[PDB]
């Protein structure tokens, strides 16, 4: 079926497709010529640790940025917006539908390795379905691979490249350059009849000895790394046979080309998976497409490019994808951990909620457009300076979503309870035990200042004057209260965000 | 499922106050066997399969009712039951005072609408599409209703059903010996041990047990009767037929056993986390328990005779120790009866700053809203009531706060409203954030304005009781004024005349 | 409960299911109108007795006979090799370990019923705890056996329960029309849809359906046959009148089929945490159905007629890819056989630090333990080969290691043990921890020793073909092998002044002895 659909795409898309060995090659011997395969080997035994740091990001980013130094086969950053013209009204619907769908696809496979999954103490069920998720995608009580103080550093740092992939087979196999050509070539050869297999690599191994280098995924992996899927890949670019990978995109082709993807859909009945993992073709033209207008999608150095593919083509409650990857982020809460919660505005009219486990550091933060307007306008004067207008681009539907998504029977420290409990009991969750620490006013806000000193960063939406009936005073932010009560408590003064940034605001 | 699990840890707690009442279930399907018109049990099955239903259908149903209630023994009697601190603790009071508030809004919901009635006519797409999600939900000049009658109290207590008539019904209307209703229901009964009964199971019972193929298993507990032979009702009658298992339906109340009972209930409530829903429709186990035991406190709460009992359970059995989610939620259905397109009227008493009684009023389908306020400046009030209307400040006391806003909030967009002088109405409706409302002034002579004033009282003074004290112009005495009456009377005014009118709020939200 | 096991198994092997309502029904008829039910009357009978012995055991396996050669649904003889593909390499391990715990567990069940329990002189303590076994089997001198039979091997496959024979039986025997026990049995099925019917919901059931009045309800799926009205053969028989509902009763087994339904039920295996018991007694729906399925490849594994298949389910199904706790219970449930305070011989092959063969012999009841060892010293072994046993060390691959230490350890505290030779017994006890034991040395004449060898190796040659090798003795002649079993049996035969003509019962399971 998938080969199907790889087939499809070449037909359809051949006249987008070039032969582009000569210039695959001439990258290969820049790199031979110019890259320290010493850090290379470096980069690898940092891909092998379980668990990585910025350090280890650091080196993988200087390293990729070497790479991409030396090539000519580049990506550029490029935006696109999608206007009806070559695409239709109903075709960029279906476009901005599969994206969405797409953004939630990828999110719930590559997000969990920044943010982690929590596998304490859970319950035998809850142990095995986590188990089962960080199989499927290639993965204290925090199961995590890499701990960054900036995942969005991770972005496009991983991408598989043939130049890189038939330098590093060259230079790490001490074969010769020719050897390793001929060898891809011949894989190559399979693929345009089939995808290949274990036993056509272990066959071919026996005329190629460059191939034992191939261990027979897609994910948690590099370009340093000597997958089958990049030795394909290089393989197809060898050829004389209309191969995907070949694809050059322009801002004057962009469209045509998704028409022409958009036309195998329908055909084929191809979609957009909600199954965390590899990426089946379509997802994966889609994705690699959308990244940049201007470049080779599958083959280029796409190391330099900066956001996501839904974020660099555009088209001109939560959703079903949202709310997926929605449960799936919620796992990183660990259920037995303390955990503050803090709402601005009534339990029954609430605004922005934060929930706040120390020990970890992780927090839930989001926002809620107000009913009644009256009573906000005088919670915004004397609590929380929230002007009504920059709510307007805050997600709706996260209040039900994630008070449903909170684990069972938790417990919840808070000052005071009344407020928190009804807005729990509004939503069902009356399995939730509540602490009220009761500090008063004075002591509740000792730490305020140090705060707003060490976390500014973390909440923009306190714009307005508030006073204390006057005299002006520090906004109330509910996250900014979770750390400053538990703060108090604690005697004294991390963080990660548990919701995407682009779950949070629309 | 989780039903079925409360339903189950019901069963375990409550067994104390469960009975084995076989024999009488029996002894009263063969006394209606024996005295019952199943010609007429035909009729009201009749009845029952029009879309649109009368007051001399409804008086067919009640007769009939009577006529069974009169031939069996397992009766509930009219018992009002007052909670008190005893058995149950303070704090079980609050828990029975907010889930007793949330039934009450959901059930209105569910039923309520059936009379009522819902605006169907030229509304958006979507307007229309949420409309008909509500009426699936609840079993049902562009109003849809069911029951039109003049006194919708009337409905009240005659839909139960009863294993009883369920086990006569099925035996003379399905033509087989009462031995083989009793044999096919008691299999279905031992199947409820266990788990509750679904298509499947009902199938494969009817293979072996064709009087079975009588109940049909896509038909709901909603808008049907005790004459209908629902999955429920079967359910009920085999529950019944065990003479054991612990079944809720063979449970009886008294006086005695009523706070143990309730205290019993709400242990398992702790437990299980079980709740009243905010979802119109069919009724989970605590939500019919709950109701089924508050209505009577000397009864068989599931399985008696119920048709004689007046009130509603939260009426019939009250705890003792502005508006609430609950009662917004039942407002804004309520609303839904409104033509947002026909000729309305507003008049109010008190000044727009300070309002006592709000009407309006729709001429064409007769529906009005009306409800009051209690006054902020006293000193003003007292001039008014003195040459305006009447009212009594310590009378504003039994009245619900709260309506202005959440009636005026619920206005439909873009209404007309139709006035005898807009100034006061503009004030009002601004103040409250609607401005939207496009207004016309009639601008009556005093003289033409009340012209109908005599005529509108005669017809209409059981609408209103607010009106007591000595009202006079500078001095004469003169008929108070009503904010209500004043909308019928400027509109017959207009009409060059002057229906039964239908009120969309309850009463029973007007009035604390 | 074990009923969730039960519905778990329903929903994934549904695909397996189909109706068999007629097939039952038509198998029924034949029943009524060819078996002859003062038979069915008669074989209820034996089975009420205490004891029963081959006479009785010959009406009851010509009984089965009768009714399988009148009914179609019947399961015919097919063995099973489980290979690598739709099972994986794990799945094998899993239903290995499972077939060796499910032996143990139906072995401790069934085979006291005919091998027997010493219940004489003991202690308080050991009367308890075997009085505590018999009752959870269903076994309500000195030794307490049900079945005293030539051939216990003979019982194989004689007890099942058919819902065609149920139905027949429940018919002609409660003198109701064929239809009344059909309906009642349907109401009894439709009940086991949801749940395990139990005497309430039966009580409830008769009263419509009086029939149901010949079902006991507390009587137990042990030591019954077939022609007995349990609780479960009604169900059982009811599960087989539904149209659908996903019976387990009526799933047929296929060549084709079989991995699949083990792959299936070991997927809710997994899902459920179903096990074997290490507890010997009625069988829990996993025990049950791994049991059924595996004793043919080519059947209906619940409500065919079985009555004709030899062996057992874990010698038709097998898995191709010291002793263990599953294995050392099945030991010590069957040396409950011996009497402690009984003459006890023993004699043993190979010298005492390293034995080939051992056996023990009660001659007043006629037990005996018998077995084989691999030896450690293969250049005395040759010797020992040539001038005693016989035994070619090949052979001795076969039977099953680490019998010595069990059963040495497993003998009766102060046991009193005679032999012709002390001093090697002595040996061979101390050097497995047992200088308890009391021995009597014999002290016979080379001469008087084997008075009896002819007249033993005449009546006992069946019971041990371990020696095959030509012996010598130096003067060379060919002299007749020394086997330990029949050394015990003839020096016995000595001291006596004779051999009497008896059947000898063995105490290990051949399946004990030999892997
Ligand atoms: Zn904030
Ligand atoms: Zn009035
Ligand atoms: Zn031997």
């Known amino acids: 079926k998938s080969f199907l659909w790889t087939q499809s795409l070449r037909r359809e898309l051949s006249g987008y497709c070039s032969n582009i060995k000569l210039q695959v090659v001439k990258?290969?011997?820049?790199?031979?010529?110019?890259?320290?395969?010493?850090?290379?080997?470096?980069?690898?035994?940092?891909?092998?640790?379980?668990?990585?740091?910025?350090?280890?990001l650091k080196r993988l980013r200087d390293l990729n940025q070497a790479v991409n130094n030396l090539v000519e086969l580049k990506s550029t950053q490029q935006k696109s917006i999608l206007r009806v013209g070559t695409l239709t009204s109903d075709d960029l619907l279906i476009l901005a539908a599969?994206?969405?769908?797409?953004?939630?696809?990828?999110?719930?496979?590559?997000?969990?390795?920044?943010?982690?999954?929590?596998?304490?103490?859970?319950?035998?069920?809850?142990?095995?379905?986590?188990?089962?998720?960080?199989?499927?995608?290639?993965?204290?009580?925090?199961?995590?691979?890499?701990?960054?103080?900036?995942?969005?550093?991770?972005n496009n740092q991983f991408?598989?490249?043939?130049?890189?992939?038939?330098?590093?087979?060259?230079?790490?196999?001490?074969?010769?350059?020719?050897?390793?050509?001929?060898?891809?070539?011949?894989?190559?050869?399979?693929?345009?009849?089939?995808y290949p297999n274990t036993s056509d690599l272990d066959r071919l191994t026996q005329s190629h000895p460059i191939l034992n280098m191939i261990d027979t995924s897609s994910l948690?992996?590099?370009?340093?790394?000597?997958?089958?899927?990049?030795?394909?890949?290089?393989?197809?670019?060898?050829?004389?046979?209309?191969?995907?990978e070949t694809i050059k995109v322009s801002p004057q082709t962009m469209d045509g080309i998704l028409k022409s993807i958009l036309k195998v859909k329908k055909a084929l009945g191809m979609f957009i998976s909600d199954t965390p993992g590899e990426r089946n073709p379509?997802?994966?033209?889609?994705?690699?497409?959308?990244?940049?207008?201007?470049?080779?999608?599958?083959?280029?150095?796409?190391?330099?490019?900066?956001?996501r593919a839904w974020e660099n083509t555009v088209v001109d409650g939560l959703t079903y994808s949202q709310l997926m990857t929605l449960k799936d982020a919620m796992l990183q809460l660990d259920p037995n951990a303390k955990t503050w919660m803090d709402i601005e505005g009534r339990p029954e009219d609430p605004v922005e909620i934060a929930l706040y486990q120390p020990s970890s550091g992780c927090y839930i933060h989001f926002f809620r457009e107000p009913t009644d307007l009256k009573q906000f306008k005088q919670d915004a004067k004397y609590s929380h300076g929230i002007d009504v207008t920059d709510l307007f681009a805050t997600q709706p539907g996260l209040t039900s979503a994630v008070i449903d998504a909170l684990p069972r029977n938790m417990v919840i420290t808070?000052?005071?309870?009344?407020?928190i409990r009804k807005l729990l009991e509004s939503q069902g969750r009356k399995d939730i035990?509540?602490?009220?620490?009761?500090?008063?006013?004075?002591?509740?806000?000792?730490?305020?200042?140090?705060?707003?000193?060490?976390?500014?960063?973390?909440?923009?939406?306190?714009?307005?004057?508030?006073?204390?009936?006057?005299?002006?005073?520090?906004?109330?932010?509910?996250?900014?209260?979770?750390?400053?009560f538990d703060a108090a408590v604690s005697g004294g003064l991390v963080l990660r965000a548990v919701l995407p940034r682009d779950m949070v605001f629309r």
């Open 220 to 244: 948690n992996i590099s370009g340093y790394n000597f997958s089958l899927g990049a030795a394909v890949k290089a393989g197809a670019c060898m050829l004389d046979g209309n191969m995907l």
């Open 27 to 56: 990258d290969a011997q820049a790199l031979l010529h110019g890259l320290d395969f010493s850090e290379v080997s470096n980069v690898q035994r940092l891909m092998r640790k379980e668990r990585r740091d910025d350090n280890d």
């Open 98 to 154: 599969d994206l969405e769908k797409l953004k939630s696809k990828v999110i719930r496979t590559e997000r969990p390795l920044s943010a982690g999954v929590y596998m304490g103490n859970l319950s035998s069920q809850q142990l095995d379905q986590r188990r089962a998720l960080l199989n499927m995608i290639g993965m204290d009580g925090v199961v995590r691979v890499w701990d960054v103080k900036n995942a969005e550093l991770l």
């Open 414 to 419: 808070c000052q005071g309870s009344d407020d």
């Open 159 to 194: 991408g598989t490249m043939p130049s890189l992939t038939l330098a590093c087979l060259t230079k790490q196999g001490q074969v010769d350059l020719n050897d390793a050509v001929q060898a891809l070539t011949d894989l190559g050869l399979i693929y345009t009849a089939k």
């Open 433 to 484: 035990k509540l602490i009220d620490i009761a500090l008063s006013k004075t002591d509740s806000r000792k730490y305020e200042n140090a705060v707003w000193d060490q976390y500014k960063d973390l909440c923009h939406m306190h714009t307005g004057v508030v006073v204390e009936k006057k005299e002006e005073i520090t906004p109330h932010c509910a996250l900014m209260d979770c750390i400053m």
């Open 282 to 307: 379509y997802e994966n033209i889609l994705y690699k497409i959308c990244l940049s207008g201007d470049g080779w999608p599958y083959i280029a150095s796409r190391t330099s490019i900066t956001g």
